[PDB]
Amino acid sequence: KVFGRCELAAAMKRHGLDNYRGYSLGNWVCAAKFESNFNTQATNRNTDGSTDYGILQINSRWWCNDGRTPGSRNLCNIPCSALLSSDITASVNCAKKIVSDGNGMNAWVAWRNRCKGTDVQAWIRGCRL
Ligand SMILES: [Cl-]
Ligand SMILES: [Cl-]
Ligand SMILES: [Cl-]
Ligand SMILES: [Cl-]
Ligand SMILES: [Cl-]
Ligand code: NA
């Protein structure tokens, strides 16, 4: 599923991400835009053989099991394919664990390079929330 900007904002709000660990909703929408272009089916392979999955590009090196990342962890306790669903629940719940692990949203490279320090409220401007 390719979300619209305001559609995704509303879904993330319903799932408790607005101001989660102090990150306002626009941060999460901005991250998703640059990680996946709002596409739940996005995948990208990394140099070390791990793979990033879904709307927030969660990495199989630590967070999910895809059966092809030897020596990795599965800290969200899910198959990586669950992160590609049209229902964003699994991605949101795993993202909550990631953002709580000490480094905040700096875990998302695209957030750090394209959203951090910008006017992220623009990403939810005009949306009925
Ligand atoms: Cl957009
Ligand atoms: Cl915001
Ligand atoms: Cl594995
Ligand atoms: Cl949902
Ligand atoms: Cl933080
Ligand atoms: Na893994």
Curated annotation (Swiss-Prot):
Molecular function via GO: beta-N-acetylglucosaminidase activity; identical protein binding; lysozyme activity
Oligomer status and interactors: Monomer.
Annotated source species: Gallus gallus
Lineage per the UniProt record: Eukaryota, Metazoa, Chordata, Craniata, Vertebrata
Stated name of the protein: Lysozyme C
Taxonomic superkingdom: Eukaryota
Gene this protein is translated from: LYZ
Tissue note: In the egg white and polymorphonuclear leukocytes.
GO biological process, one term: defense response to Gram-positive bacterium
Keyword Signal: yes
Note, other: Lysozyme C is capable of both hydrolysis and transglycosylation; it also shows a slight esterase activity. It acts rapidly on both peptide-substituted and unsubstituted peptidoglycan, and slowly on chitin oligosaccharides.
Coiled coil (residue ranges): none
Alphabetized UniProt keyword annotations: Allergen, Antimicrobial, Bacteriolytic enzyme, Disulfide bond, Glycosidase, Hydrolase, Secreted, Signal
Gene Ontology terms: cellular component: cytoplasm; endoplasmic reticulum; extracellular space
